[PDB]
mmCIF file of C-alpha atoms (C1' of nucleotides) in Angstrom:
data_model
loop_
_atom_site.group_PDB
_atom_site.id
_atom_site.type_symbol
_atom_site.label_atom_id
_atom_site.label_comp_id
_atom_site.label_asym_id
_atom_site.label_seq_id
_atom_site.Cartn_x
_atom_site.Cartn_y
_atom_site.Cartn_z
ATOM 1 C CA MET A 1 0.014 0.029 -0.003
ATOM 2 C CA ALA A 2 0.973 3.658 0.220
ATOM 3 C CA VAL A 3 2.478 3.383 3.736
ATOM 4 C CA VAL A 4 3.326 7.102 3.251
ATOM 5 C CA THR A 5 5.952 5.927 0.768
ATOM 6 C CA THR A 6 9.522 6.217 2.066
ATOM 7 C CA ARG A 7 8.665 8.564 4.973
ATOM 8 C CA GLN A 8 7.775 5.775 7.442
ATOM 9 C CA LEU A 9 10.751 3.718 6.302
ATOM 10 C CA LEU A 10 13.202 6.531 6.825
ATOM 11 C CA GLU A 11 11.681 7.459 10.157
ATOM 12 C CA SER A 12 11.787 3.895 11.444
ATOM 13 C CA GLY A 13 15.223 3.043 10.056
ATOM 14 C CA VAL A 14 14.573 0.254 7.608
ATOM 15 C CA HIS A 15 17.498 1.511 5.503
ATOM 16 C CA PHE A 16 19.952 0.000 7.992
ATOM 17 C CA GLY A 17 21.651 -3.182 7.005
ATOM 18 C CA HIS A 18 24.871 -5.085 7.789
ATOM 19 C CA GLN A 19 28.547 -4.227 7.577
ATOM 20 C CA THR A 20 31.179 -5.607 5.191
ATOM 21 C CA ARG A 21 32.237 -8.561 7.424
ATOM 22 C CA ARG A 22 29.477 -10.900 6.166
ATOM 23 C CA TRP A 23 27.522 -10.434 2.957
ATOM 24 C CA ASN A 24 25.496 -12.368 0.415
ATOM 25 C CA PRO A 25 27.053 -11.753 -3.035
ATOM 26 C CA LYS A 26 23.648 -11.731 -4.761
ATOM 27 C CA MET A 27 23.136 -8.161 -3.474
ATOM 28 C CA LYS A 28 25.450 -6.483 -5.964
ATOM 29 C CA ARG A 29 22.509 -4.792 -7.768
ATOM 30 C CA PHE A 30 21.123 -3.888 -4.282
ATOM 31 C CA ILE A 31 23.564 -1.182 -3.257
ATOM 32 C CA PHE A 32 22.729 2.466 -2.484
ATOM 33 C CA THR A 33 25.657 3.935 -0.553
ATOM 34 C CA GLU A 34 28.368 2.779 1.842
ATOM 35 C CA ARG A 35 27.504 4.861 4.906
ATOM 36 C CA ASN A 36 29.514 4.254 8.125
ATOM 37 C CA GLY A 37 30.017 0.580 7.313
ATOM 38 C CA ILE A 38 26.323 -0.275 7.686
ATOM 39 C CA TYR A 39 24.825 -1.029 4.258
ATOM 40 C CA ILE A 40 22.020 1.330 3.096
ATOM 41 C CA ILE A 41 18.780 0.158 1.424
ATOM 42 C CA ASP A 42 17.670 2.609 -1.191
ATOM 43 C CA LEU A 43 14.075 2.092 0.036
ATOM 44 C CA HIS A 44 12.696 3.059 -3.426
ATOM 45 C CA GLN A 45 12.256 -0.363 -5.065
ATOM 46 C CA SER A 46 11.161 -1.477 -1.585
ATOM 47 C CA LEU A 47 7.837 0.190 -2.216
ATOM 48 C CA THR A 48 7.391 -1.741 -5.446
ATOM 49 C CA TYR A 49 8.361 -5.042 -3.779
ATOM 50 C CA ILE A 50 5.997 -4.550 -0.815
ATOM 51 C CA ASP A 51 3.274 -3.609 -3.350
ATOM 52 C CA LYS A 52 3.878 -6.857 -5.219
ATOM 53 C CA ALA A 53 3.830 -8.829 -1.927
ATOM 54 C CA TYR A 54 0.547 -7.063 -1.098
ATOM 55 C CA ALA A 55 -0.885 -8.049 -4.500
ATOM 56 C CA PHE A 56 0.140 -11.655 -4.004
ATOM 57 C CA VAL A 57 -1.313 -11.871 -0.494
ATOM 58 C CA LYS A 58 -4.595 -10.403 -1.926
ATOM 59 C CA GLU A 59 -4.590 -13.104 -4.600
ATOM 60 C CA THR A 60 -3.835 -15.822 -1.985
ATOM 61 C CA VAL A 61 -6.726 -14.667 0.192
ATOM 62 C CA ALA A 62 -8.924 -14.394 -2.879
ATOM 63 C CA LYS A 63 -8.280 -18.112 -3.462
ATOM 64 C CA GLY A 64 -8.926 -18.420 0.265
ATOM 65 C CA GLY A 65 -5.834 -17.399 2.183
ATOM 66 C CA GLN A 66 -3.705 -19.234 4.756
ATOM 67 C CA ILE A 67 -0.545 -17.411 5.793
ATOM 68 C CA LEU A 68 1.833 -19.095 8.298
ATOM 69 C CA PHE A 69 3.635 -16.317 10.235
ATOM 70 C CA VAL A 70 6.921 -17.969 11.291
ATOM 71 C CA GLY A 71 9.218 -16.067 13.574
ATOM 72 C CA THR A 72 11.931 -16.674 16.210
ATOM 73 C CA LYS A 73 14.009 -13.560 16.717
ATOM 74 C CA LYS A 74 13.675 -11.627 19.939
ATOM 75 C CA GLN A 75 12.866 -8.564 17.833
ATOM 76 C CA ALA A 76 9.741 -10.265 16.471
ATOM 77 C CA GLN A 77 8.634 -12.479 19.353
ATOM 78 C CA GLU A 78 6.373 -9.820 20.906
ATOM 79 C CA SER A 79 5.287 -8.456 17.563
ATOM 80 C CA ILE A 80 4.289 -11.420 15.361
ATOM 81 C CA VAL A 81 2.002 -13.029 17.959
ATOM 82 C CA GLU A 82 -0.158 -10.006 18.684
ATOM 83 C CA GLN A 83 -0.988 -9.141 15.050
ATOM 84 C CA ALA A 84 -1.411 -12.790 14.099
ATOM 85 C CA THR A 85 -3.890 -13.298 16.942
ATOM 86 C CA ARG A 86 -5.678 -10.068 15.975
ATOM 87 C CA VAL A 87 -6.106 -11.247 12.378
ATOM 88 C CA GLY A 88 -6.785 -14.843 13.392
ATOM 89 C CA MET A 89 -3.904 -16.008 11.182
ATOM 90 C CA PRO A 90 -1.760 -19.102 12.028
ATOM 91 C CA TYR A 91 1.647 -18.359 13.484
ATOM 92 C CA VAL A 92 4.654 -19.942 15.174
ATOM 93 C CA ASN A 93 6.839 -17.847 17.470
ATOM 94 C CA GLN A 94 8.973 -20.140 19.677
ATOM 95 C CA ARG A 95 11.419 -22.733 18.301
ATOM 96 C CA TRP A 96 10.253 -23.464 14.795
ATOM 97 C CA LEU A 97 11.099 -27.213 14.854
ATOM 98 C CA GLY A 98 12.220 -29.592 12.192
ATOM 99 C CA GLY A 99 9.039 -30.911 10.662
ATOM 100 C CA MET A 100 5.541 -29.459 10.863
ATOM 101 C CA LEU A 101 5.646 -28.509 7.152
ATOM 102 C CA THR A 102 6.992 -32.054 6.420
ATOM 103 C CA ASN A 103 5.861 -33.858 9.616
ATOM 104 C CA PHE A 104 2.221 -33.073 8.990
ATOM 105 C CA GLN A 105 0.997 -36.409 10.506
ATOM 106 C CA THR A 106 2.972 -36.058 13.713
ATOM 107 C CA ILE A 107 2.041 -32.386 14.137
ATOM 108 C CA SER A 108 -1.659 -33.175 13.487
ATOM 109 C CA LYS A 109 -1.406 -35.917 16.119
ATOM 110 C CA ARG A 110 0.040 -33.421 18.596
ATOM 111 C CA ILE A 111 -2.673 -30.921 17.604
ATOM 112 C CA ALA A 112 -5.378 -33.463 18.447
ATOM 113 C CA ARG A 113 -3.564 -34.338 21.716
ATOM 114 C CA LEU A 114 -3.323 -30.685 22.715
ATOM 115 C CA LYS A 115 -7.013 -30.186 21.800
ATOM 116 C CA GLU A 116 -8.117 -33.062 24.017
ATOM 117 C CA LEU A 117 -5.757 -32.312 26.912
ATOM 118 C CA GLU A 118 -6.671 -28.604 27.126
ATOM 119 C CA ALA A 119 -10.145 -29.804 28.159
ATOM 120 C CA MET A 120 -9.468 -33.033 30.090
ATOM 121 C CA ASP A 121 -6.636 -31.541 32.222
ATOM 122 C CA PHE A 122 -8.814 -28.610 33.236
ATOM 123 C CA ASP A 123 -11.732 -30.924 34.032
ATOM 124 C CA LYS A 124 -9.521 -33.140 36.175
ATOM 125 C CA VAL A 125 -7.831 -30.269 38.009
ATOM 126 C CA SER A 126 -11.192 -28.550 38.697
ATOM 127 C CA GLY A 127 -13.124 -31.705 39.625
ATOM 128 C CA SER A 128 -11.903 -34.978 40.993
ATOM 129 C CA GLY A 129 -8.859 -35.034 43.140
ATOM 130 C CA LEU A 130 -5.460 -36.104 41.847
ATOM 131 C CA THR A 131 -2.022 -36.843 43.336
ATOM 132 C CA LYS A 132 1.013 -34.595 42.920
ATOM 133 C CA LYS A 133 3.768 -35.175 40.304
ATOM 134 C CA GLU A 134 1.165 -36.658 37.933
ATOM 135 C CA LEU A 135 -1.224 -33.760 37.466
ATOM 136 C CA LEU A 136 1.815 -31.535 37.818
ATOM 137 C CA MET A 137 3.710 -33.349 35.021
ATOM 138 C CA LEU A 138 0.634 -33.375 32.752
ATOM 139 C CA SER A 139 0.235 -29.675 33.366
ATOM 140 C CA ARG A 140 3.965 -29.112 32.580
ATOM 141 C CA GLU A 141 3.633 -31.064 29.366
ATOM 142 C CA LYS A 142 0.631 -28.914 28.491
ATOM 143 C CA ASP A 143 2.700 -25.773 29.252
ATOM 144 C CA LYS A 144 5.568 -26.985 27.043
ATOM 145 C CA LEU A 145 3.245 -27.817 24.190
ATOM 146 C CA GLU A 146 1.590 -24.389 24.527
ATOM 147 C CA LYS A 147 4.993 -22.651 24.523
ATOM 148 C CA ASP A 148 6.145 -24.592 21.441
ATOM 149 C CA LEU A 149 2.823 -24.268 19.608
ATOM 150 C CA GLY A 150 0.780 -21.143 19.178
ATOM 151 C CA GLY A 151 -1.373 -20.375 16.124
ATOM 152 C CA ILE A 152 -0.610 -23.759 14.586
ATOM 153 C CA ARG A 153 -3.948 -24.942 15.960
ATOM 154 C CA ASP A 154 -6.057 -23.833 12.989
ATOM 155 C CA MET A 155 -4.982 -25.493 9.739
ATOM 156 C CA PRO A 156 -7.155 -28.128 8.056
ATOM 157 C CA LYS A 157 -4.469 -29.073 5.557
ATOM 158 C CA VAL A 158 -1.213 -27.906 3.967
ATOM 159 C CA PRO A 159 -0.954 -24.034 4.102
ATOM 160 C CA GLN A 160 -0.938 -21.659 1.130
ATOM 161 C CA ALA A 161 1.987 -19.272 1.956
ATOM 162 C CA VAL A 162 4.617 -18.712 4.649
ATOM 163 C CA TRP A 163 5.872 -15.398 6.007
ATOM 164 C CA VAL A 164 9.474 -15.550 7.233
ATOM 165 C CA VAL A 165 11.398 -13.149 9.457
ATOM 166 C CA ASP A 166 15.209 -13.554 9.813
ATOM 167 C CA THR A 167 15.701 -16.372 7.323
ATOM 168 C CA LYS A 168 19.249 -16.807 8.657
ATOM 169 C CA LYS A 169 17.842 -18.016 11.965
ATOM 170 C CA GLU A 170 14.783 -19.720 10.445
ATOM 171 C CA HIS A 171 16.612 -21.296 7.536
ATOM 172 C CA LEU A 172 14.974 -24.723 7.875
ATOM 173 C CA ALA A 173 11.532 -23.187 7.262
ATOM 174 C CA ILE A 174 12.515 -22.132 3.713
ATOM 175 C CA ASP A 175 14.089 -25.554 2.974
ATOM 176 C CA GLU A 176 10.812 -27.283 3.953
ATOM 177 C CA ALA A 177 8.801 -24.658 2.049
ATOM 178 C CA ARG A 178 10.792 -25.186 -1.136
ATOM 179 C CA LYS A 179 10.616 -28.978 -0.760
ATOM 180 C CA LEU A 180 6.802 -28.857 -0.498
ATOM 181 C CA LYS A 181 6.370 -26.012 -3.044
ATOM 182 C CA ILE A 182 4.586 -23.363 -0.973
ATOM 183 C CA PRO A 183 4.878 -19.610 -1.701
ATOM 184 C CA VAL A 184 7.392 -17.827 0.467
ATOM 185 C CA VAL A 185 7.473 -14.149 1.486
ATOM 186 C CA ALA A 186 10.385 -13.174 3.728
ATOM 187 C CA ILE A 187 12.223 -10.227 5.224
ATOM 188 C CA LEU A 188 15.764 -10.173 3.810
ATOM 189 C CA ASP A 189 18.582 -7.845 4.649
ATOM 190 C CA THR A 190 21.818 -7.533 2.699
ATOM 191 C CA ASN A 191 23.000 -11.068 3.781
ATOM 192 C CA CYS A 192 20.105 -13.194 2.542
ATOM 193 C CA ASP A 193 19.369 -14.974 -0.745
ATOM 194 C CA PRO A 194 16.797 -14.192 -3.471
ATOM 195 C CA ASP A 195 16.966 -17.673 -4.990
ATOM 196 C CA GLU A 196 15.195 -19.231 -1.993
ATOM 197 C CA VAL A 197 12.492 -16.540 -1.836
ATOM 198 C CA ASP A 198 9.908 -16.000 -4.575
ATOM 199 C CA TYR A 199 8.359 -12.690 -3.468
ATOM 200 C CA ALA A 200 11.321 -11.027 -1.847
ATOM 201 C CA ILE A 201 10.991 -7.948 0.392
ATOM 202 C CA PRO A 202 14.435 -6.394 1.160
ATOM 203 C CA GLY A 203 14.902 -4.558 4.404
ATOM 204 C CA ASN A 204 16.402 -4.585 7.879
ATOM 205 C CA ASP A 205 15.607 -7.482 10.245
ATOM 206 C CA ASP A 206 17.607 -6.559 13.353
ATOM 207 C CA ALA A 207 15.283 -4.002 15.048
ATOM 208 C CA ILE A 208 12.011 -4.764 16.883
ATOM 209 C CA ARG A 209 9.996 -2.196 14.941
ATOM 210 C CA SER A 210 11.794 -2.796 11.654
ATOM 211 C CA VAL A 211 10.012 -6.160 11.268
ATOM 212 C CA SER A 212 7.034 -4.857 13.271
ATOM 213 C CA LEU A 213 5.791 -2.396 10.689
ATOM 214 C CA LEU A 214 6.082 -4.988 7.905
ATOM 215 C CA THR A 215 4.235 -7.572 9.966
ATOM 216 C CA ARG A 216 1.601 -4.996 10.824
ATOM 217 C CA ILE A 217 0.975 -4.020 7.201
ATOM 218 C CA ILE A 218 0.770 -7.633 6.047
ATOM 219 C CA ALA A 219 -1.615 -8.292 8.997
ATOM 220 C CA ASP A 220 -3.774 -5.407 7.766
ATOM 221 C CA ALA A 221 -3.642 -6.963 4.306
ATOM 222 C CA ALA A 222 -4.711 -10.326 5.726
ATOM 223 C CA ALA A 223 -7.560 -8.758 7.686
ATOM 224 C CA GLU A 224 -8.772 -6.876 4.594
ATOM 225 C CA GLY A 225 -8.663 -10.076 2.602
ATOM 226 C CA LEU A 226 -10.544 -11.991 5.301
ATOM 227 C CA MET A 227 -13.225 -9.291 5.223
ATOM 228 C CA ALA A 228 -13.423 -9.497 1.491
ATOM 229 C CA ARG A 229 -13.783 -13.281 1.700
ATOM 230 C CA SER A 230 -17.365 -12.777 2.998
ATOM 231 C CA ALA A 231 -18.372 -11.352 -0.409
ATOM 232 C CA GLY A 232 -16.001 -13.676 -2.242
ATOM 233 C CA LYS A 233 -17.830 -16.720 -0.891
ATOM 234 C "C1'" G B 1 20.325 -50.145 27.078
ATOM 235 C "C1'" C B 2 18.025 -51.886 22.358
ATOM 236 C "C1'" U B 3 14.899 -50.202 18.420
ATOM 237 C "C1'" C B 4 10.750 -48.332 15.392
ATOM 238 C "C1'" G B 5 7.067 -44.849 12.423
ATOM 239 C "C1'" U B 6 7.441 -40.263 9.916
ATOM 240 C "C1'" G B 7 10.535 -36.349 8.566
ATOM 241 C "C1'" U B 8 15.396 -34.773 7.147
ATOM 242 C "C1'" C B 9 20.802 -35.508 5.398
ATOM 243 C "C1'" G B 10 23.719 -38.442 2.126
ATOM 244 C "C1'" U B 11 24.424 -41.758 -4.737
ATOM 245 C "C1'" G B 12 24.801 -45.613 -1.062
ATOM 246 C "C1'" A B 13 25.514 -48.688 3.225
ATOM 247 C "C1'" G B 14 23.939 -45.354 6.794
ATOM 248 C "C1'" A B 15 22.820 -40.995 9.867
ATOM 249 C "C1'" U B 16 19.578 -37.870 12.724
ATOM 250 C "C1'" G B 17 16.208 -38.924 16.797
ATOM 251 C "C1'" U B 18 19.548 -41.852 20.694
ATOM 252 C "C1'" U B 19 24.890 -35.833 19.850
ATOM 253 C "C1'" G B 20 25.613 -31.569 23.357
ATOM 254 C "C1'" G B 21 25.247 -28.940 28.841
ATOM 255 C "C1'" G B 22 23.270 -30.342 33.823
ATOM 256 C "C1'" U B 23 21.364 -34.257 36.711
ATOM 257 C "C1'" U B 24 19.896 -39.246 38.297
ATOM 258 C "C1'" A B 25 20.476 -45.726 40.952
ATOM 259 C "C1'" A B 26 18.503 -45.433 35.733
ATOM 260 C "C1'" G B 27 18.069 -43.550 27.633
ATOM 261 C "C1'" U B 28 15.895 -40.664 35.361
ATOM 262 C "C1'" C B 29 14.606 -36.118 34.149
ATOM 263 C "C1'" C B 30 15.963 -30.840 32.590
ATOM 264 C "C1'" C B 31 18.059 -27.271 28.808
ATOM 265 C "C1'" G B 32 19.286 -26.613 23.966
ATOM 266 C "C1'" C B 33 18.737 -29.134 19.357
ATOM 267 C "C1'" A B 34 16.425 -31.479 11.962
ATOM 268 C "C1'" A B 35 14.119 -33.454 14.543
ATOM 269 C "C1'" C B 36 8.882 -34.607 15.884
ATOM 270 C "C1'" G B 37 6.935 -39.254 18.109
ATOM 271 C "C1'" A B 38 6.303 -44.046 19.887
ATOM 272 C "C1'" G B 39 7.875 -49.171 21.801
ATOM 273 C "C1'" C B 40 10.498 -52.801 24.626
ATOM 274 C "C1'" G B 41 13.800 -51.927 29.070
ATOM 275 C "C1'" C B 42 14.269 -48.030 34.142
ATOM 276 C "C1'" A B 43 10.576 -46.585 37.511
ATOM 277 C "C1'" A B 44 5.538 -47.592 39.537
ATOM 278 C "C1'" C B 45 1.442 -51.204 40.002
ATOM 279 C "C1'" C B 46 2.499 -56.966 43.303
ATOM 280 C "C1'" C B 47 4.674 -59.709 47.987
ATOM 281 C "C1'" U B 48 7.180 -58.851 52.676
ATOM 282 C "C1'" U B 49 9.107 -55.712 56.610
ATOM 283 C "C1'" G B 50 8.959 -50.728 59.759
ATOM 284 C "C1'" U B 51 4.043 -46.703 62.184
ATOM 285 C "C1'" U B 52 -1.049 -46.223 62.903
ATOM 286 C "C1'" C B 53 -6.728 -46.597 62.671
ATOM 287 C "C1'" A B 54 -11.319 -49.206 62.045
ATOM 288 C "C1'" C B 55 -13.652 -54.364 62.242
ATOM 289 C "C1'" U B 56 -13.724 -59.137 64.431
ATOM 290 C "C1'" G B 57 -12.242 -62.070 69.747
ATOM 291 C "C1'" U B 58 -11.069 -68.499 69.279
ATOM 292 C "C1'" U B 59 -7.968 -72.543 69.597
ATOM 293 C "C1'" G B 60 -5.183 -65.875 70.733
ATOM 294 C "C1'" C B 61 -4.739 -61.903 74.625
ATOM 295 C "C1'" C B 62 -5.883 -60.500 80.400
ATOM 296 C "C1'" A B 63 -6.152 -53.968 82.041
ATOM 297 C "C1'" G B 64 -10.893 -53.501 85.655
ATOM 298 C "C1'" C B 65 -14.736 -57.604 88.085
ATOM 299 C "C1'" A B 66 -16.211 -62.642 90.504
ATOM 300 C "C1'" C B 67 -13.679 -67.884 92.018
ATOM 301 C "C1'" G B 68 -10.473 -71.299 91.377
ATOM 302 C "C1'" U B 69 -7.391 -77.723 95.373
ATOM 303 C "C1'" U B 70 -2.177 -74.611 96.679
ATOM 304 C "C1'" A B 71 -1.755 -74.203 91.806
ATOM 305 C "C1'" U B 72 -2.803 -73.422 85.138
ATOM 306 C "C1'" G B 73 -7.073 -66.796 81.558
ATOM 307 C "C1'" G B 74 -8.573 -72.978 84.620
ATOM 308 C "C1'" U B 75 -13.305 -70.157 85.272
ATOM 309 C "C1'" G B 76 -17.728 -66.266 84.161
ATOM 310 C "C1'" G B 77 -16.449 -62.242 81.537
ATOM 311 C "C1'" G B 78 -13.762 -58.262 79.057
ATOM 312 C "C1'" G B 79 -12.292 -54.904 73.431
ATOM 313 C "C1'" A B 80 -8.097 -52.182 77.035
ATOM 314 C "C1'" C B 81 -3.053 -54.103 75.794
#
RNA sequence: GCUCGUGUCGUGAGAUGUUGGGUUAAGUCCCGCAACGAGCGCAACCCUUGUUCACUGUUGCCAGCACGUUAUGGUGGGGAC
């Protein structure tokens, strides 16, 4: 969308990148100016790329829409979850584990187990008595499953697209996504790869708000598409 | 301790899980983790021993009561031990 063009980007500081020490060579075209070691995003083609990502997410929600918001960095832990819960869009925030996208059967088994336990554990703790170190360990297992699984509850089948923040940390997600052929949209700074991302959105990924405004705008896009789905049906 | 399902890595045998840090009598748990799970083992359920309560009182027991061959709770009786 408009997102007041480059004004919001410049005020927030998206133009920041990484220094010369580590760099992905596929960024040769993507160079504005060498300012104080930190690489500078031109932020001009960024508008076009975010517009293209917006168009693709509109098309995905037109065909029905299922975006998996994957995130692990401390700069996005407290940002991804709130917007994903607001839009009602599936998300993972703590320890994206090997599988899920490929271990569909096991993850669905754990989804069913979590669904049944979230009721039976509460019924047992609130009703009939139970001894210690058994109810306690079941509650602890519930807590661990809740910590390691958030918005993954609601998915009937394989998703439609995945939104990635800090692909360097969440590398395995893109490998699974490319193996199973799902659209990928990711935040990439000057050290990431365009070959493994179809709809690439360059920009900083080291600040809390730097990923927060992008996740907020894509959440607004998802909410608008979900509203339009009422007429689309 | 030994393995499996699925995933993943490798052309392949195979690997990962099951490595690492901490802990435990224990692959016992915890933390992190391309692993996510499960199974047989460990543990627990069983028997016995250590404390205690209720119930029952003979062929067991005898605190309070009455005699007993002198004598043996032998006796009527007693639920205390």
